[PDB]
Design a protein around this ligand. Structure first.
Ligand SMILES: O=C(O)[C@@H]1CCC[C@H]1c1ccc2nccnc2c1
Length: 166
């Protein structure tokens, strides 16, 4: 949890323009959040990048979790190993609003963060899931009560979020 270079947006939400893979390798936080789908198939976006950084160890562990427990629900989560990125990975499923999943479930998705005192995380449902990233930051701020360090890869997006929030 040796985070550096973050801007404090609220009492408990911090933001940095950084690649979450590189933040995780440098900080080795207690918890790194993955933006997952219900079958934990880490094919693209943040999920593909975190899985690639574990050289597919996260995918093999995830397939075993699904074979024993079944898929997650939208708005749900599970805690698995963080491998070389963190002590734990919290795999959280935000709604895929491009496939008709209700945006109201974005609040349920962020509620999972409250089970952990400190987390390194991306914006949920942004990117391939289709939600507006600034709306996702708003739900994060309105919902998460624990300390969250958000890593935003795209500089244009990061600047938009900081200008809209400060
Ligand atoms: O922060 C961002 O710019 C977006 C917002 C939601 C998903 C974020 C993200 C971060 C790292 C990624 N690395 C490889 C591929 N896609 C990624 C996507």
């Amino acid at each position: 949890n040796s985070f550096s270079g973050y801007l404090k947006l609220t009492d408990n939400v911090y933001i940095k323009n950084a690649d979450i893979v590189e933040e995780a390798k440098k900080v080795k936080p207690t918890v790194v959040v993955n933006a997952a789908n219900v079958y934990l198939k880490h094919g693209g976006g943040v999920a593909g990048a975190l899985n690639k950084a574990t050289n597919n160890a996260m995918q093999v562990e995830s397939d075993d979790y699904i074979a024993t427990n079944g898929p997650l629900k939208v708005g749900g989560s599970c805690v698995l190993s963080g491998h070389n990125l963190a002590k734990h990975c919290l795999h959280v499923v935000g709604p895929n609003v491009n496939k008709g999943e209700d945006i109201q479930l974005l609040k349920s998705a962020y509620e999972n963060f409250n089970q952990h005192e400190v987390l390194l995380a991306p914006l949920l449902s942004a990117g391939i899931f289709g939600a507006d990233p600034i709306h996702s930051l708003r739900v994060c701020v309105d919902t998460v009560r624990t300390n969250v360090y958000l890593a935003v890869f795209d500089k244009n997006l990061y600047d938009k979020l900081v200008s809209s929030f400060l």
